[PDB]
Amino acid sequence: KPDCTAAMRDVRQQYESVAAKNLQEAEEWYKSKFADLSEAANRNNDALRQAKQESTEYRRQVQSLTMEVDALK
Amino acid sequence: SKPDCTAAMRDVRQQYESVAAKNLQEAEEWYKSKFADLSEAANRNNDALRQAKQESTEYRRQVQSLTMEVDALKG
């Protein structure tokens, strides 16, 4: 009479393969949603880099015109 | 008593149920954690952009006012 260790090993393995495919399909879903939320989060990457640069440019312009007016007054 | 591994096989299925559910939970938590981080980051970007724009709105008006001061002063 078997001690059932062979039966236990076969059961573990069966449940191990199937559970792994279920996990994988679940991760594939999470990764697809990640890609989506990442696009969204970076939608305005460029517009932000340029708005920041545009702000610096304007500050310096304002400051220089401020100094011109003072030189004139 | 007849050979029968029914009960041992079932204890094995139940033990691996917990394992599987554990790994599925580990993944859910890791991904939900990244999903909230991307939400935080998007809002941060959107508010950074807005404040940037308002800066330039303000400066633009100043450029206009000052350019005319300059003009009136030079003659």
PDB file of C-alpha atoms in Angstrom:
ATOM      1  CA  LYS A   1       0.000   0.000   0.000  1.00  0.00           C
ATOM      2  CA  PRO A   2       1.346   3.425  -1.067  1.00  0.00           C
ATOM      3  CA  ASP A   3       2.074   5.995   1.614  1.00  0.00           C
ATOM      4  CA  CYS A   4       0.373   8.524  -0.688  1.00  0.00           C
ATOM      5  CA  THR A   5       3.490  10.687  -1.171  1.00  0.00           C
ATOM      6  CA  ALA A   6       3.408   9.994  -4.909  1.00  0.00           C
ATOM      7  CA  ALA A   7      -0.260  11.052  -5.013  1.00  0.00           C
ATOM      8  CA  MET A   8       0.510  14.170  -2.966  1.00  0.00           C
ATOM      9  CA  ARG A   9       3.390  15.109  -5.280  1.00  0.00           C
ATOM     10  CA  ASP A  10       1.215  14.810  -8.386  1.00  0.00           C
ATOM     11  CA  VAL A  11      -1.554  16.928  -6.864  1.00  0.00           C
ATOM     12  CA  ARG A  12       0.825  19.711  -5.812  1.00  0.00           C
ATOM     13  CA  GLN A  13       2.367  19.813  -9.296  1.00  0.00           C
ATOM     14  CA  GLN A  14      -0.986  19.892 -11.100  1.00  0.00           C
ATOM     15  CA  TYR A  15      -2.272  22.735  -8.917  1.00  0.00           C
ATOM     16  CA  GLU A  16       1.106  24.454  -9.260  1.00  0.00           C
ATOM     17  CA  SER A  17       1.039  24.678 -13.061  1.00  0.00           C
ATOM     18  CA  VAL A  18      -2.551  25.837 -13.330  1.00  0.00           C
ATOM     19  CA  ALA A  19      -2.247  28.395 -10.549  1.00  0.00           C
ATOM     20  CA  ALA A  20       0.805  29.837 -12.278  1.00  0.00           C
ATOM     21  CA  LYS A  21      -1.054  30.417 -15.551  1.00  0.00           C
ATOM     22  CA  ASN A  22      -3.818  32.147 -13.644  1.00  0.00           C
ATOM     23  CA  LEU A  23      -1.253  34.418 -11.957  1.00  0.00           C
ATOM     24  CA  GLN A  24       0.426  35.186 -15.259  1.00  0.00           C
ATOM     25  CA  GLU A  25      -2.845  36.148 -16.971  1.00  0.00           C
ATOM     26  CA  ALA A  26      -3.546  38.365 -13.971  1.00  0.00           C
ATOM     27  CA  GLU A  27      -0.160  40.069 -14.270  1.00  0.00           C
ATOM     28  CA  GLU A  28      -0.619  40.568 -18.018  1.00  0.00           C
ATOM     29  CA  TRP A  29      -3.790  42.476 -17.178  1.00  0.00           C
ATOM     30  CA  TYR A  30      -1.991  44.606 -14.544  1.00  0.00           C
ATOM     31  CA  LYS A  31       0.836  45.396 -16.926  1.00  0.00           C
ATOM     32  CA  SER A  32      -1.579  46.506 -19.647  1.00  0.00           C
ATOM     33  CA  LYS A  33      -3.326  48.810 -17.219  1.00  0.00           C
ATOM     34  CA  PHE A  34       0.046  50.101 -16.030  1.00  0.00           C
ATOM     35  CA  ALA A  35       1.023  51.046 -19.592  1.00  0.00           C
ATOM     36  CA  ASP A  36      -2.291  52.905 -19.831  1.00  0.00           C
ATOM     37  CA  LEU A  37      -1.906  54.856 -16.613  1.00  0.00           C
ATOM     38  CA  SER A  38       1.692  55.638 -17.633  1.00  0.00           C
ATOM     39  CA  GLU A  39       0.686  57.163 -20.940  1.00  0.00           C
ATOM     40  CA  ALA A  40      -1.859  59.237 -19.066  1.00  0.00           C
ATOM     41  CA  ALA A  41       0.670  60.327 -16.456  1.00  0.00           C
ATOM     42  CA  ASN A  42       3.097  61.471 -19.120  1.00  0.00           C
ATOM     43  CA  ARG A  43       0.595  62.935 -21.583  1.00  0.00           C
ATOM     44  CA  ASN A  44       1.811  66.459 -20.848  1.00  0.00           C
ATOM     45  CA  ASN A  45       5.556  65.704 -20.597  1.00  0.00           C
ATOM     46  CA  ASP A  46       6.479  68.116 -23.417  1.00  0.00           C
ATOM     47  CA  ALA A  47       4.011  70.886 -22.598  1.00  0.00           C
ATOM     48  CA  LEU A  48       5.394  70.949 -19.058  1.00  0.00           C
ATOM     49  CA  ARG A  49       9.010  71.165 -20.144  1.00  0.00           C
ATOM     50  CA  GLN A  50       8.111  74.075 -22.397  1.00  0.00           C
ATOM     51  CA  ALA A  51       5.844  75.888 -19.951  1.00  0.00           C
ATOM     52  CA  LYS A  52       8.665  75.795 -17.383  1.00  0.00           C
ATOM     53  CA  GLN A  53      11.160  77.156 -19.922  1.00  0.00           C
ATOM     54  CA  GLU A  54       8.705  79.807 -21.040  1.00  0.00           C
ATOM     55  CA  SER A  55       8.304  80.988 -17.452  1.00  0.00           C
ATOM     56  CA  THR A  56      12.083  81.463 -16.959  1.00  0.00           C
ATOM     57  CA  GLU A  57      12.335  83.333 -20.269  1.00  0.00           C
ATOM     58  CA  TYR A  58       9.559  85.703 -19.259  1.00  0.00           C
ATOM     59  CA  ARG A  59      10.959  86.415 -15.803  1.00  0.00           C
ATOM     60  CA  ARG A  60      14.260  87.458 -17.333  1.00  0.00           C
ATOM     61  CA  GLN A  61      12.459  89.577 -19.922  1.00  0.00           C
ATOM     62  CA  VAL A  62      10.415  91.302 -17.223  1.00  0.00           C
ATOM     63  CA  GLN A  63      13.532  91.852 -15.113  1.00  0.00           C
ATOM     64  CA  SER A  64      15.442  93.349 -18.028  1.00  0.00           C
ATOM     65  CA  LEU A  65      12.564  95.698 -18.922  1.00  0.00           C
ATOM     66  CA  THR A  66      12.275  96.653 -15.290  1.00  0.00           C
ATOM     67  CA  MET A  67      16.008  97.653 -15.419  1.00  0.00           C
ATOM     68  CA  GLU A  68      15.462  99.590 -18.667  1.00  0.00           C
ATOM     69  CA  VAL A  69      12.634 101.612 -17.171  1.00  0.00           C
ATOM     70  CA  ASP A  70      14.777 102.397 -14.128  1.00  0.00           C
ATOM     71  CA  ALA A  71      17.669 103.512 -16.291  1.00  0.00           C
ATOM     72  CA  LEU A  72      15.148 105.752 -18.074  1.00  0.00           C
ATOM     73  CA  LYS A  73      13.664 107.169 -14.862  1.00  0.00           C
TER      74      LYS A  73
ATOM     75  CA  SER B   1      -8.705  -0.666   5.348  1.00  0.00           C
ATOM     76  CA  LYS B   2      -8.373  -0.050   1.591  1.00  0.00           C
ATOM     77  CA  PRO B   3      -5.642   2.182   0.133  1.00  0.00           C
ATOM     78  CA  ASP B   4      -7.051   5.662  -0.462  1.00  0.00           C
ATOM     79  CA  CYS B   5      -5.180   8.947  -0.746  1.00  0.00           C
ATOM     80  CA  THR B   6      -8.286  11.100  -0.991  1.00  0.00           C
ATOM     81  CA  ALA B   7      -7.832  12.856   2.344  1.00  0.00           C
ATOM     82  CA  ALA B   8      -4.081  13.517   1.920  1.00  0.00           C
ATOM     83  CA  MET B   9      -4.585  14.800  -1.618  1.00  0.00           C
ATOM     84  CA  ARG B  10      -7.250  17.202  -0.327  1.00  0.00           C
ATOM     85  CA  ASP B  11      -5.028  18.574   2.434  1.00  0.00           C
ATOM     86  CA  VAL B  12      -2.460  19.217  -0.313  1.00  0.00           C
ATOM     87  CA  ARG B  13      -4.982  21.082  -2.492  1.00  0.00           C
ATOM     88  CA  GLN B  14      -6.006  23.215   0.464  1.00  0.00           C
ATOM     89  CA  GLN B  15      -2.391  24.081   1.335  1.00  0.00           C
ATOM     90  CA  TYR B  16      -1.682  25.157  -2.230  1.00  0.00           C
ATOM     91  CA  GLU B  17      -4.904  27.172  -2.322  1.00  0.00           C
ATOM     92  CA  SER B  18      -3.415  29.404   0.376  1.00  0.00           C
ATOM     93  CA  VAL B  19      -0.133  29.601  -1.509  1.00  0.00           C
ATOM     94  CA  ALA B  20      -1.738  30.612  -4.795  1.00  0.00           C
ATOM     95  CA  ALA B  21      -3.967  33.193  -3.113  1.00  0.00           C
ATOM     96  CA  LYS B  22      -0.883  34.602  -1.384  1.00  0.00           C
ATOM     97  CA  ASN B  23       1.001  35.117  -4.642  1.00  0.00           C
ATOM     98  CA  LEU B  24      -2.061  36.640  -6.282  1.00  0.00           C
ATOM     99  CA  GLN B  25      -2.373  39.043  -3.352  1.00  0.00           C
ATOM    100  CA  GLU B  26       1.329  39.934  -3.489  1.00  0.00           C
ATOM    101  CA  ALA B  27       0.858  40.935  -7.127  1.00  0.00           C
ATOM    102  CA  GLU B  28      -2.338  42.891  -6.589  1.00  0.00           C
ATOM    103  CA  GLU B  29      -0.747  44.961  -3.809  1.00  0.00           C
ATOM    104  CA  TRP B  30       2.396  45.677  -5.780  1.00  0.00           C
ATOM    105  CA  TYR B  31       0.387  46.819  -8.832  1.00  0.00           C
ATOM    106  CA  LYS B  32      -2.239  48.818  -6.956  1.00  0.00           C
ATOM    107  CA  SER B  33       0.651  50.539  -5.215  1.00  0.00           C
ATOM    108  CA  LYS B  34       2.158  51.511  -8.573  1.00  0.00           C
ATOM    109  CA  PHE B  35      -1.239  52.613  -9.873  1.00  0.00           C
ATOM    110  CA  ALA B  36      -1.647  55.098  -7.018  1.00  0.00           C
ATOM    111  CA  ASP B  37       1.895  56.335  -7.629  1.00  0.00           C
ATOM    112  CA  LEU B  38       1.039  57.072 -11.265  1.00  0.00           C
ATOM    113  CA  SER B  39      -2.088  58.915 -10.166  1.00  0.00           C
ATOM    114  CA  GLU B  40      -0.120  61.033  -7.777  1.00  0.00           C
ATOM    115  CA  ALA B  41       2.431  61.735 -10.495  1.00  0.00           C
ATOM    116  CA  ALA B  42      -0.150  62.721 -13.105  1.00  0.00           C
ATOM    117  CA  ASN B  43      -1.838  65.189 -10.750  1.00  0.00           C
ATOM    118  CA  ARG B  44       1.580  66.563  -9.789  1.00  0.00           C
ATOM    119  CA  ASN B  45       2.402  67.112 -13.467  1.00  0.00           C
ATOM    120  CA  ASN B  46      -0.962  68.718 -14.145  1.00  0.00           C
ATOM    121  CA  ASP B  47      -0.605  71.132 -11.253  1.00  0.00           C
ATOM    122  CA  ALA B  48       3.000  71.885 -12.102  1.00  0.00           C
ATOM    123  CA  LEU B  49       1.849  72.725 -15.636  1.00  0.00           C
ATOM    124  CA  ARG B  50      -1.005  74.940 -14.457  1.00  0.00           C
ATOM    125  CA  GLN B  51       1.189  76.954 -12.093  1.00  0.00           C
ATOM    126  CA  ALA B  52       3.794  77.367 -14.830  1.00  0.00           C
ATOM    127  CA  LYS B  53       1.159  78.737 -17.200  1.00  0.00           C
ATOM    128  CA  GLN B  54      -0.180  81.202 -14.635  1.00  0.00           C
ATOM    129  CA  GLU B  55       3.356  82.514 -14.132  1.00  0.00           C
ATOM    130  CA  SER B  56       3.605  83.351 -17.832  1.00  0.00           C
ATOM    131  CA  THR B  57       0.139  84.830 -17.953  1.00  0.00           C
ATOM    132  CA  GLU B  58       1.283  87.206 -15.230  1.00  0.00           C
ATOM    133  CA  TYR B  59       4.687  87.990 -16.767  1.00  0.00           C
ATOM    134  CA  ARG B  60       3.126  88.637 -20.181  1.00  0.00           C
ATOM    135  CA  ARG B  61       0.969  91.392 -18.803  1.00  0.00           C
ATOM    136  CA  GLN B  62       4.071  92.867 -17.155  1.00  0.00           C
ATOM    137  CA  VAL B  63       6.016  92.745 -20.422  1.00  0.00           C
ATOM    138  CA  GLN B  64       3.199  94.701 -22.073  1.00  0.00           C
ATOM    139  CA  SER B  65       2.916  97.356 -19.423  1.00  0.00           C
ATOM    140  CA  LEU B  66       6.686  97.870 -19.279  1.00  0.00           C
ATOM    141  CA  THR B  67       7.216  97.965 -23.022  1.00  0.00           C
ATOM    142  CA  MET B  68       4.871 100.910 -23.123  1.00  0.00           C
ATOM    143  CA  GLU B  69       6.526 102.600 -20.143  1.00  0.00           C
ATOM    144  CA  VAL B  70       9.794 102.171 -22.002  1.00  0.00           C
ATOM    145  CA  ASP B  71       8.361 103.644 -25.170  1.00  0.00           C
ATOM    146  CA  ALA B  72       6.836 106.675 -23.473  1.00  0.00           C
ATOM    147  CA  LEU B  73      10.107 107.365 -21.654  1.00  0.00           C
ATOM    148  CA  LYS B  74      12.433 107.181 -24.627  1.00  0.00           C
ATOM    149  CA  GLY B  75      10.094 109.673 -26.296  1.00  0.00           C
TER     150      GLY B  75
END
